[PDB]
Design a protein around this ligand. Structure first.
Ligand SMILES: [Cl-]
Ligand SMILES: [Cl-]
Ligand SMILES: [Cl-]
Ligand SMILES: [Cl-]
Ligand SMILES: [Cl-]
Ligand SMILES: [Mg+2]
Ligand SMILES: [Mg+2]
Lengths: 147, 145, 157, 144, 144, 157, 144, 53
RNA sequence: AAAAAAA
RNA sequence: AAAAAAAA
RNA sequence: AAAAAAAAA
RNA sequence: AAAAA
RNA sequence: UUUUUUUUUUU
RNA sequence: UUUUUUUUU
RNA sequence: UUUUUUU
RNA sequence: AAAAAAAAA
RNA sequence: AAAAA
RNA sequence: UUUUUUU
RNA sequence: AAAAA
C-alpha cells in the first residue's frame, strides 16, 4: 500500500557528505570458553575480535554487559552453576555474580552490567572477567560496542 | 545509568544468537573513469577490510550516489551519469548531474525499488559511471548479509 | 524594616557609585579553577601518512592553558588549512585515539568545491571522557592538504 | 546515551579565539600594618597561581575582604576598604567588624557598571586597613 | 504611635561606613566673558558651602545651566554647553536661548552611563558660552 | 545545540568584557551617508526690506554639514533674535522660495509681549522637497527686529 | 552532569560511622545426611567470603533453602526447615518438595519482627532435613 | 585544582570538598592516589563517599 | 497508488 | 512495597 | 534508548 | 548541567 | 494552500 | 526523590 | 523508517 | 492604638 | 515618607 | 495573650 | 518611515 515504485528513481543529491568507511558497531558476540573445575578462567577481550564475528577489523571494544550460560552438563548429582567476576584495568572487582540451575538438565546463567563510568575501551590483551563453573564449558554473550 | 558499580543481571534461558549478523552501511569509495568511456562499478568493491566487510559475500544494494572526485576539463562544468545495472536486466536510465560552478562537484544518485533489491555478489556490477572528471566518488547505501 | 541609611544605589541595576556588600563568612575558594575551552590550533600533515595529534598542543601560552597538566577532551573538529593538490577536492579523516584502546574509525569529510575546506569532527562519549596529559594522543589525521586546522572542545583541569 | 564515538557533520570553519576572556574569583592575601593603609596592587591578580598570568588587563567588578589572622588582645577584628580609581579615588571606608573575637571581620563593595574600566598591574584596586596583620581578599573580576 | 523610648533587640555588629557616598544637585555660578568659552572646573563641586569638601572625586550625571544676569541691550539671553571628558572632549554645543529678554536661557545635557567615570578637582566638566556675564549651573552628580 | 565554549557575556545586555561577533560577508557600506538635521543660524535684516536666505548658510563647519553640497529642506522656523524698535511688538514674515516658482505667501507671527520673540514657520509639502544647492534661496525674511534666528529642518545628501 | 571536578561547599564535620550495618542475602551450602536434622550455625554467615568477617552479630530476617544435589533414585527432592530461636526453638517443619525429580526442592520461612534479635556465631538459625546430601541456603539478614 | 576552604572562626574547622564527574569515576586500587591535601593544620579528617567493588 | 513533468 | 549505607 | 543507514513543498 | 553576589 | 501525461488496484 | 544491598506483589 | 544491541 | 510582659513543628 | 530628569 | 493608658 | 548587530 504505502510502497514505492517498481523502477529506479533519480536522487537529487547535493554536496559530498561526511563519510566513514569503518564505522562503529553495537554487537552481542556469542562465544564459548573452557573452564576447569575450581579454577577461574580469565576471559580475554581478544576473543571478541575475530572473522567469525566480522570483528577482525576492530582492535578496541567497549564492553557493556556480560551474560554467561553453562554449556555442558554438570557433574553427576550436581546442579549447574556459573560465576562471574568483573575485571577492569583500573581495578579488578571482587564480585562473584553467580547463577545456578534449578533443574540439573538446565543451564545455569548469570550476567552483569558495566556502569557508564566503567565503559572504557579494551584491547585483545585485556580481560573481561573471571569465570567459574562446575561445567567444563561456559557460553558467553557479551553486549559490546566495537569502535 | 546513575549507577556507579557493576550490577547483577537476572538472565534466563540462553538466547537466540547470531555471530555474523547483517549490517546496513553507506560505503564510500572511488573509481577511475576515462573520458567518453563507461565504467562498470564492481560490487566486489564493497567487500574489503577497509570497510569491515570482507567477511560478507553478498550485499543488497539500495541506493547509489556519485560525486565527481576530481576537477573537470578546462572550460567545462563537472558532470556524472549513472546507468543502473541489474542481473535480471540492465536499465537504460542515465541519471545525470551537472555542477553549476566549475570548482564544484557534480553529483547524482538513484534509488533501487524494493522489487529489485536482491543480493549481488562480487562478480556482479552495480551501475555504469560516466563523467568528464577522471575519478568519481561513490557512496552506496547497501545491506550486507 | 528597622532602617539605618548611607548609600545611593539607585534601583537595582542602575547604581552610579560604589555600594557596600554585607559579606559574611569566608567562602570556599579556588585559585586554580577548571576551564572549558575551544582550543584552535593547526597541525602539519604529509599526503598519505597519518599524524598522531599530541594532547600537549592544548597546553600553551597561546591558549592561556599553561597552568594545566591534564584535560578532558569532549569533541574534535578538523578543517583542511591549505589548498589540495592540483585537480583534487580537499579531504580530511579523523581516527579517535584512547589510552584504553585506539579506535578504528576514519570519520572523513570532503569538500564539494576545490576552493573550500573539507571538514569533519567527532564526539567522545561520556564513558570515554577521561583526562589526558601532554604525552597522550587525541586522533590520527589524514589529509591531501598539507596542514589541518583543529578546534578541540575540552575541559582543562 | 551513546557509548561509542559519533560523527559530527561539521561545516565551515568557525570564528575562533585562542585567548578568550575569563570571569574569576581570585583569592589572595596581603600584609597590613597597624594603622597604615595598604594599596592592594592590581598586579596580584595576574599570576600562574591563578592561571591568569597570560592576562595584562582586568575589569574589577566587586571586592571582598576578610581578616586572615587573629586581632590584637582584647580587640575584635575589623577591616576597611576604600575604592581606588584611576579617574578619581573614592573616600568611602567600607568597614566590617567581627562580633566574636575568634571570628573574621569581612565587608566588601560593588563597583558600578560605569566605573568598570580595565586596570593593569601598575594600578591599585583599593586601600585596606585592619587591626589584623593579614587580610584575605576575594576579587570578582573579568580578565581580558 | 509610641510616645516613649523602646528597646531595640539589636544583634551582631553590622557593616558600617563613616564616609558614605552622596548624590547631589550642586548649584554654583561662574563668570563668563563675551565670546569666550569658560572651562567649568570640577573642583567647584568640592566645598564646605556644599558639605562636599570631604570628597575628592565625583561622578557627574547631568549638567544644567541658566544665565544668571541680564543679556546685553537688544539681545535675548543664551547659553551653550560643550561636554568635556578626559578620554576625549566632545564638540556638541548644546544651546538654549530665552524667548523673553527678561527671562533666563537655560539648556542642559545628560552624560550616558558609559561616560560616567570619576573626575577630580583638576578636571573640567564642560565649556560654557553666553552673552550674559554670569551663568548659574546645577550639576547632578554622585560624590564618592 | 552542539557547544563550543570561550566567552563570558553575562545575560544579554550585561556583558563586562569584549565578545566575539560572528560577522559574515562584507556588507553594503556608505562612508558618506545622509544626515537629517535641525540647523540653527541667524540672519541680519533691515526694517522694511526683504532678505533672501541662501541655502549655503546650511553647509558650514559650525553644523558639521561641510561635506555636503545639496540639501532637501523640509520646514523652516523663524524667531526674531533682537528686540524690536521702541513702542513695537516684534514680528517676522516668511515667504517660501523655490527654483520652480517663488511663492507669494507671507507667513507672519507677532509677539504679544514686546519683550518676547515673534515666531513663525512653514512646512514644505513633499511635492516641493527637492534638493537645493548653496546658490539657492530658501525664503524671504522681513522683521522690525534687525536679526532673525532660523532653525531649518532639512536632510543633507 | 559536568565533565570536570566541581567544588562542594561542605560545612560542619558530619556524623560518621566507619563500621556501618549491612543488609544482605548470604548464599552458602550445608552438608546434610539422610534422615538426620542438621543445625545450621549462624557462624556460617561470618566469613571473608561474604565480606562479613568484621561482624560479630547478625539479625536474621528470612531463611530460604534449596536442595543442592540430586535426590536418591526414584525420589523427588525435598527439604524441611525448623526455625530455631534462643528464647525457644520452634517445631514447625516448613517443607518443600520438587514435583520433578530433576528439579530443586525449596522452602523458606520469615522471622516476625518480634523474633528478630541478634545472633552470634555460636547460635543456630534452623534445623535442615533433606533426602539430598547438600542444601543451599540464602539467608536475608542485617549484619550489625 | 586547589579546592580550598578556610575557617571564619579560629576555633572552627575548615572543610571544602569536591565531586568527581561521572566520566572520571573509574576504579582505583590501593597503589593509586585520590587527592593531594594541604593544610596549616597538622591532621586533616576526611570523609570519602565511594563505591566498593 | 507508481513513474516523466510542472509553481 | 520496604529496610539498611551513600548522594540530592 | 544506543549504534549504522535514509528526505520533500 | 564549567567560572562571579 | 485547490490544479499535467500512461498505467492501475481497492474504494 | 535517585545509586548500592535485601525482602514483597 | 530498515538492520545489530539493551530496556 | 500605645506601654510592660510572653512561643512551637 | 532624607538627597537627582 | 495578661497588666497600665487612650480611642 | 534618515544613521548602527
Ligand atoms: Cl526437565
Ligand atoms: Cl566516496
Ligand atoms: Cl568559487
Ligand atoms: Cl539610602
Ligand atoms: Cl561560555
Ligand atoms: Mg565543475
Ligand atoms: Mg535436589
Amino acid at each position: 500500500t504505502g510502497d514505492n515504485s517498481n523502477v529506479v528513481t533519480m536522487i537529487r543529491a547535493g554536496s559530498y557528505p561526511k563519510v566513514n568507511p569503518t564505522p562503529t558497531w553495537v554487537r552481542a558476540i556469542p562465544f564459548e570458553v573452557s573452564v576447569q573445575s575450581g579454577i577461574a578462567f580469565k576471559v580475554p577481550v581478544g576473543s571478541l575480535f575475530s572473522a567469525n564475528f566480522r570483528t577482525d577489523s576492530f582492535t578496541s571494544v567497549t564492553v557493556m554487559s556480560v551474560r554467561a550460560w553453562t554449556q555442558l552438563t554438570p557433574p553427576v548429582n550436581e546442579y549447574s552453576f556459573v560465576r562471574l567476576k568483573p575485571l577492569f584495568k583500573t581495578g579488578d572487582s571482587t564480585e562473584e555474580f553467580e547463577g545456578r540451575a534449578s533443574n540439573i538438565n538446565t543451564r545455569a546463567s548469570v550476567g552483569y552490567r558495566i556502569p557508564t563510568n566503567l565503559r572504557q575501551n579494551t584491547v585483545a590483551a585485556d580481560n573481561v572477567c573471571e569465570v567459574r563453573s562446575n561445567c567444563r564449558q561456559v557460553a558467553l554473550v557479551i553486549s559490546c560496542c566495537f569502535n
